A paper describes a structure:
In platelets, scrambling is mediated by the protein [name], which catalyzes the externalization of phosphatidylserine (PS) in response to an increase in the intracellular Ca2+ concentration to trigger blood clotting. [name] belongs to the TMEM16 protein family, whose members either function as Ca2+ activated anion-selective channels or as Ca2+ activated lipid scramblases. To better understand how the small sequence differences in [name] give rise to its distinct functional properties, we determined the structure of murine [name] ([name]) by cryo-EM in Ca2+-bound and Ca2+-free states, both in a detergent and in a lipid environment. By combining data from cryo-electron microscopy, in vitro scrambling assays and electrophysiology, our study has provided insight into the diverse functional behavior of [name], a member of the TMEM16 family that facilitates the transport of lipids and ions across cellular membranes. Both processes are controlled by the binding of Ca2+ to a site located within the transmembrane domain that is accessible from the cytoplasm and they are mediated by the same structural element located at the periphery of each subunit.
For that purpose, we determined structures of [name] in the absence and presence of Ca2+. Structures of the protein in the detergent digitonin were determined for Ca2+-bound and Ca2+-free states by cryo-EM at 3.2 Å and 3.6 Å, respectively. The equivalence of the Ca2+-free conformation of [name] with an inactive ligand-free state of a TMEM16 scramblase is evident in the low RMSD of 2.0 Å of a superposition with the Ca2+-free conformation of nhTMEM16 in nanodiscs. The conformational changes that take place in [name] upon ligand binding can be appreciated in the comparison of Ca2+-bound and Ca2+-free conformations. As in mTMEM16A, the absence of Ca2+ causes a local transition confined to the pore region, whereas the remainder of the structure remains largely unaffected. Besides comparably small rearrangements of α3 and α4, which are less pronounced in the nanodisc structures, the largest difference is found at the intracellular half of α6 (α6c). In the ligand-free state, this helix has altered its conformation in response to the loss of the positively charged interaction partner, leading to an increase in mobility of α6c as indicated by the weaker density. The transition can be described by a rigid-body movement of α6c by 20°, around a hinge located close to a conserved glycine residue (Gly 615), whose equivalent in mTMEM16A was shown to be critical for conformational rearrangements. Thus, whereas in the apo-form of mTMEM16A α6c approaches α4, thereby closing the gap between both helices, the movement of α6c in [name] is directed away from α4.
Author numbering:
A (entry chain B), B (entry chain A): 45 to 79, 90 to 147, 195 to 427, 447 to 490, 502 to 632, 646 to 790, 793 to 877
The structure:
Amino acid sequence: QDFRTPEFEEFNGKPDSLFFTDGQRRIDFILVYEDTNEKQKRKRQAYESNLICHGLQLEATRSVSDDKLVFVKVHAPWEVLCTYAEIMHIKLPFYILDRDSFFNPATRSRIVYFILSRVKYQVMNNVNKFGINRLVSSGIYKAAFPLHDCRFNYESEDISCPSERYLLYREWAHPRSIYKKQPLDLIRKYYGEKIGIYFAWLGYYTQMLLLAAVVGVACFLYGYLDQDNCTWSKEVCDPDIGGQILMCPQCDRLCPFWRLNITCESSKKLCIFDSFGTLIFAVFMGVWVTLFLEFWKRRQAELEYEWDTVELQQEEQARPEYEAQCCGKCIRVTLCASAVFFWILLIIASVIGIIVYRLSVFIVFSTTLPYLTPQMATSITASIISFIIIMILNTIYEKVAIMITNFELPRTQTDYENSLTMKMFLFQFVNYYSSCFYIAFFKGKFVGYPGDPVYLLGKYRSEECDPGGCLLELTTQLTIIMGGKAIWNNIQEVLLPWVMNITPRWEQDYHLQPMGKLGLFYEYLEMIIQFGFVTLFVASFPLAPLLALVNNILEIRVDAWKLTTQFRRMVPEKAQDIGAWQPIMQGIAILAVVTNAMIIAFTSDMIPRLVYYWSFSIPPYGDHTYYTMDGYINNTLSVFNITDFKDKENPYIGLGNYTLCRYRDFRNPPGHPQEYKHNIYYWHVIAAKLAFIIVMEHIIYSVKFFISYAIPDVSKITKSKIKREKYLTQK
Amino acid sequence: QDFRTPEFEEFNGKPDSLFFTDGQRRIDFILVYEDTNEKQKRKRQAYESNLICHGLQLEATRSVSDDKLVFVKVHAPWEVLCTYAEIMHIKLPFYILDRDSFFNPATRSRIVYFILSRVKYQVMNNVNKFGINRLVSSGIYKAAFPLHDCRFNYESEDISCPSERYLLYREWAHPRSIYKKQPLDLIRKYYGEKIGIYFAWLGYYTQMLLLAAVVGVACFLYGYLDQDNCTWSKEVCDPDIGGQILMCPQCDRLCPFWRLNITCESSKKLCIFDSFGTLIFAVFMGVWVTLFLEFWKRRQAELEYEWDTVELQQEEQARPEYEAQCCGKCIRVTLCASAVFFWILLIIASVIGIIVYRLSVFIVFSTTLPYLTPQMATSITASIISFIIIMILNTIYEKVAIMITNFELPRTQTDYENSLTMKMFLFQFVNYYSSCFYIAFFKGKFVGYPGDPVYLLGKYRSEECDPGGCLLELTTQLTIIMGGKAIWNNIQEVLLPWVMNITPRWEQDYHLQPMGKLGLFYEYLEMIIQFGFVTLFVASFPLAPLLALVNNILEIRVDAWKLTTQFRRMVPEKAQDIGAWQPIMQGIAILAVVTNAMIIAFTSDMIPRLVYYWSFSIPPYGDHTYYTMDGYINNTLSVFNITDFKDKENPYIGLGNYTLCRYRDFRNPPGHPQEYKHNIYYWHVIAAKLAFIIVMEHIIYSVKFFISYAIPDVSKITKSKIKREKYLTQK
Ligand SMILES: CCCCCCCCCC(=O)OC[C@@H](COP(=O)(O)OCC[N+](C)(C)C)OC(=O)CCCCCCCCC
Ligand SMILES: CCCCCCCCCC(=O)OC[C@@H](COP(=O)(O)OCC[N+](C)(C)C)OC(=O)CCCCCCCCC
């Protein structure tokens, strides 16, 4: 009730003062309020009473535009600065040249934020009810933000203070400054080591993506230049050889007998994407991943020394919702785990809907066709509809997961962000990569011969793949999803405000958007999901690091322009690493080695070509003299006489005027004793596929272990600097 | 020259005083010397001068038995105790009840050892030439040991001091106290947290080996009880079926045509060791390994809290050899790496000598035979000769590796122990497990059909395996090596001093053996090598954890009796973990998952039995009705008509009066078009083997990752104790 703030001067002489009316002390925080309201007014006055009794100097100012709002300028004198600096253990370099400039205003802002989080506001209905975040959650204060130095598109009128926001906008956040390196010490000094380590991680990720994109475009150029040497494509759309294959139908009855002449252009793309260049690129990408992780740990330790992020934390004060709300926690985490499991089953049901749509619209496209084949058109529209489902479901799960982790009770903001990180990454992982996993590993891998086809649930045959392989469909789906997400983000964040185009400093900072309690987390998530698209399916097509590099180069500058201009100034924090995203990245790495090996083995369909080249064109099995690839299509596809194993009994007879069809499997001809069991060539191919998985997995994992053992976790320059600062501190 | 020690009292009133002649101050160290000698005498007197000038109180005593030796009792007063306790940051619990008993004499001994390592002994030929270890390396002091409390087999005569060595011998080191648990706080308090963490690791290793041995003897009892249900053994030594197989010869000419009747007893053991019980045990042993590592990290963090081992280290003073001796370091480490690579190539040449011996003595045993077959006798004598070579080579490499790492120059004792650990573990690893790796993975796996056998170097055919499999020979080799090492250590350390069966305290402690600069390191190495025998080849036979448990139970007590009675009292040190042995153990774990999977797949020969049971006894391939195992031997072994592919041209004709032989491979009969290429059954078996490797490796590694994620790295009780001590220290 007593000890009100010093009353309003409201002079508004300079538009950007960043100082009190006496001009000798600097504003650190701004607290905004308005004026059943009498007890809240007593509450605010008691908070300011305990605030002045703690030692912070205060001032009021009524707003010149809207007289309901009152702005409270908060300054910390030097004494409480030294006491709470010794309390929270801030590392310092020494310079007593200016007491005001000894602490940069980021450090002053986090000191005043610690003081505002410690102050009790006298409400003892529940005893010891304290906090500034409780006041803005209760609504008696609207915000407790610090101030920006100046406008971004102008110069600070005060020549005393540095116009650091203008310098950061001119050198880092302008889109016509996209070529310059990020000034990382300015970003750290102005925004804290939680934002600075994010932008350092993003710049380093951009450099490693540049390396991977250079090697990927080299391998893709090798494939595109060596697309003429490929023999099986030239054989499959030779009209004499592939035109007379007469492939067996794919659906039950409503699909006609089709020839293998039609897939030529498809195979003319497919040899660019399943060649030896993609194998060399995936074997490179494993080593690139372990280089990425090891040099990230080196850069993280270098930032840990240089930005002194290991300073001692506080006791991690609980959330105001957890203080205001408080076997039960066990059934709560069980209920939220069952909810996220139910949502994962919903996205699996969406994938099954994509399968059923693929079958039905393939029948429709086949009957409406009389360039692009019906299979490629079916795959393209399926990928489009699928990606639209991905966008709808990830927005809906964003809202639902916010509500789910708000339903259960975490203790602090760290545990809240960790639980939200876990469930959000789990559904974003499954939601983005489940369709690609089904295309790569479970599409056409379980269908039988046309005499006894397999039925998944009855009346729906499992979808058959093209005789070249399902790698082109996986490439189409992956490119559609990744490019659609990149174009969606570059229309939402970049194109929208670009196509859209006196008062004091605190009033200008009020008319902005706060960053939120999560902050950079969502942005982090995008890159992590993008990381999986770089890493899990890199053998699908090698041009994914180039698209990721373009999206990352634009993402750095759109995050910079969002953070400098759009968002309010946040309280600077300390962070030694990115958080849970580094264990998530290591898990994605360890899984994606296996995923790349299984994409080259099962999906890419180059191991049958290698086995036919080395062991099946030889006089024990083939009529050729030496190792050669011609005659691959005629000796690969199995022959089927029309003898249904089975009650309709007419899948192919009603439209068939030819007695013999061919199909993509490795089984015996019908004249054989074991007429439709698996051939010796099938088991040769399967043994070679699993041997390739074992050899590539063990070689890549041993190389990654040896590289992680050979590269030190911290650089020699950083060890020398640590030794030098220890030796100078000891004296 | 000045400030000599206070002169000799030599009263020798009590045999165990552990106090000075005044009786108020406790002896902490004993420095022994004797008396071109004049400069060394001046050196010793200058060392004692700087010692008394630092503040330590000294006393001399001439020896009553041998008058050349002089014993110097070293006491630290309370002032220098507090100053150097604040210097080296010793954690304390508070009790000023006795100033002498505030620091236990282990802490007093390590304080006085720090002081003796800091003191400069005035020799400024090379400037600042300092250390106590330099004096005992130079020979002017013989030793600088602390004192034991009392005799082990008697009670201390002084009722003031606790007879802690007698209590430790009575409760921990006596072989008639083998059933009691180790008193770990007494071991830690008396011997430092370098010995205490070793014995805690050994006791915990014994408990986990007890668990693994219980499950292993359960699986072995399942195999031994279910040895009658096994069908292929009953078929192979049925005289009607296996007696008429007439297997094809193994060597070139001097091996006769042998029948498969002879292997019955061998197969009667082999079904005990390749059954489903060993597969279940290896799948269990992966989870047991990750449980071992996770609960070891939990116990290590619990000891880290309880024994405060994380206290701040000093600057890691260099070795006296490195101070006395000092592109060059690069060529030195290159030369020592080439030396250890040359020695590894020598042990590979010894393995090749074992191969050549196996072939030649199999010919000799086959010609001298007219129970045990010649193959089993050949394997047994080969394992005996091999194990003798292992013992000779590991002793010789122990001496050679000491000389090699003494040739190159490490800076400190930590780097010296790490380099010796690396090269010693590398050769002990290769030396112990190379013969077992060759038996499991490269024995009989590369031999062709008897028409075109393979020659490794010319005139020597690669050795063929028995049709049951090489798992019995691997079991024999593993049991011989492990039991021979255990019996060798229990004859050398245990049986030898057991079959072998006034003066002051410092004279009794002098007539002992010092522990050495390496200490427990060699003992550590044995358990680590034994750990590989528990882990890498556990699917060979499941009774290896039982033998390891017996050897570990005896090893705890022989290390206790060595350390309490035989060895001199060492200076207590601090250690947070075991050292390099924990990364070495994690590497052995990660390798041994793969090694167990490849032992079950390639060596165990149960995947051909499963494939014949499920897919080759069926009317597509077999004459049987349902899944059954009878007819495995007749339908498994390939048939060979005598048609040599090839200049001797008579390997089998000279002793052969039968036109048809059978051999252990999966190839076609001679009437086939592809007469001797690999069968469809071969590629089915190979694909099933590699699928088993992939499935078991990914399942075991995912289970190990999920268990390492599910179990916390530190216990909840230890977190509560850390919270409580932090909350009490904050007040
Ligand atoms: C861990 C993260 C991603 C896991 C993805 C699982 C991949 C599953 C692969 C699969 O379904 O293959 C099953 C069969 C069929 O072999 P394919 O060569 O696909 O036969 C169909 C191709 N063809 C129509 C031209 C004849 O192949 C086999 O019989 C070999 C089975 C080996 C499976 C190993 C999976 C690892 C499980 C932990
Ligand atoms: C990493 C630590 C330990 C590594 C140990 C390496 C193991 C090598 C296994 C091996 O040599 O097998 C080669 C062939 C032969 O298959 P087997 O079934 O052994 O044929 C001989 C058996 N038979 C006489 C009854 C007919 O089998 C194959 O063709 C499949 C080759 C797959 C090799 C995977 C090794 C991983 C290398 C990094």
